[PDB]
């Protein structure tokens, strides 16, 4: 337990607000994503060192399992689900 740094930014679009992630915070070990309880949990991708999107091993936690803990830390996250997408970017990078 110490001082963590969670600096994220997501595209502000009222159309993709449905899958819009509530809040996001990472850690030196793993990263967690908080999503609405009334909404569905989408799949969060990550931009590999190559240039394409890759789906990292995700996990589910929380009192309602509305959280998604990904086993990796990057600077660019691509949340996709159904026919909507929400671009997220981490401006800090602790690890």
């Amino acid at each position: 337990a110490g001082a963590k740094n969670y600096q994220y930014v997501m595209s502000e679009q009222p159309e993709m607000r449905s899958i819009q992630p509530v809040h996001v915070w990472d850690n030196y070990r793993f990263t967690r994503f908080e999503f609405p309880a009334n909404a569905e949990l989408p799949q969060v991708y990550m931009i590999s060192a190559s240039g394409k999107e890759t789906l990292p091993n995700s996990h589910v936690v929380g009192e309602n399992r509305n959280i998604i803990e990904v086993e990796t830390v990057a600077k660019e996250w691509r949340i996709r689900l159904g026919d909507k997408v929400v671009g997220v970017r981490n401006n800090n990078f602790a690890p």
Binding site: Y6, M16, V85
Partner: peptide
């Protein structure tokens, strides 16, 4: 319709900040 993140107003994902006031 095609979503695509236009980053129109680019809204952060940290507003509440989990710190738990004591």
């Amino acid at each position: 319709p095609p979503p695509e993140p236009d980053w129109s107003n680019t809204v952060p994902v940290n507003k509440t900040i989990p710190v738990d006031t004591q």
